[PDB]
Design a protein around this nucleic acid. Sequence first.
DNA 1: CCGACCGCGCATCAGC
DNA 2: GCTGATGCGC
DNA 3: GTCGG
Length: 324
Amino acid sequence: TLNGGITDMLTELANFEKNVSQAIHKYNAYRKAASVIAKYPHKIKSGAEAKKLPGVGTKIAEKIDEFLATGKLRKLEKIRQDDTSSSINFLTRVSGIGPSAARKFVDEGIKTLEDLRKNEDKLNHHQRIGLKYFGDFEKRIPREEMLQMQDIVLNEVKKVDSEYIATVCGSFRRGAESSGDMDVLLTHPSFTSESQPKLLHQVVEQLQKVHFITDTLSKGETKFMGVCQLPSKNDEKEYPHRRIDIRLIPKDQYYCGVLYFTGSDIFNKNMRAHALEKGFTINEYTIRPLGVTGVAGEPLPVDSEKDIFDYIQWKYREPKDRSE
DNA sequence: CCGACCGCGCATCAGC
DNA sequence: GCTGATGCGC
DNA sequence: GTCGG
Ligand SMILES: Nc1nc(C[C@H]2C[C@H](O)[C@@H](COP(=O)(O)OP(=O)(O)OP(=O)(O)O)O2)c(NC=O)c(=O)[nH]1
Ligand SMILES: [Ca+2]
Ligand SMILES: [Ca+2]
Ligand SMILES: [Ca+2]
Ligand code: NA
Ligand code: NA
């Protein structure tokens, strides 16, 4: 919490730009600034000092000097006191309510969870589920629970067909102590770029059959987004409901997918910048060679995460060591 | 100065 | 009925 | 809002 007041302020400004101004690039600018400042190992003494960090520019340096001298930001103070902005900001915490729906709801006097619960007819299916689990979806997931969730998913997937490959990615695969949701990448040897039906559906159905998956936000042939819950013992309290995504990826793009969806964002960026310096380009699907004039060639064969590191002559980085 | 800032799968809607 | 645009999440 | 061409 060296500069926790500054990072809190920048995050509040970010959330305002995202939810109220509908300016996703300023949201990400403020987020970027807050991240580098949370990494900085000194209590910032001036805006000029922070401005030396990448992502901190002139207007953020100005806000830091105001916050340092006064302990507050009058832009934020006015925003907090604006009832419309505060209601729009709150409503976007419902999964499925974005800035457009939030503003539309607030315009017609729908401002609170109660107002939403009163107006289920004006909600689409996703929004109804987000409202249903409003508190649960904002809880984090302890790693011990993730581990238990991974066991169910891998086991039920194996039960459908032994040849499925399922990998839990995101912050969990990087070894985090808690996760926000569960990210599952699924493949099968029979599904390639140049190619069985219902491959995702059968896994989703089996997980519903054992009452692990409890709700569906969206589902198609390659991506499922829904809700799941660990089973409870007959004497203890039930578990929170959890967000879970399952994506079906072709096997020849699978390990590029695992690489991408493990992250982190900073690590992917560093790994792709290094790939370029070696004459390769990595995206979420493929690694391709670069010709002399920057033309990408055909995708290279990838049987594992390690193959990707080998191509660019990088020693394998363990998922836990991929924070950057 | 000024354009880019990831962009795609799914759900939903406006227009044909 | 269809297609393309958009909101949303990530 | 920040960055870079
Ligand atoms: N789960 C998920 N992630 C991404 C983004 C990629 C790049 C990112 O470094 C990596 C993990 O991002 P994610 O939002 O899952 O964050 P994570 O590190 O898992 O933290 P948390 O979810 O809070 O536990 O996946 C997606 N694609 C685009 O954003 C996606 O559809 N689903
Ligand atoms: Ca995640
Ligand atoms: Ca609950
Ligand atoms: Ca993408
Ligand atoms: Na939302
Ligand atoms: Na997330």
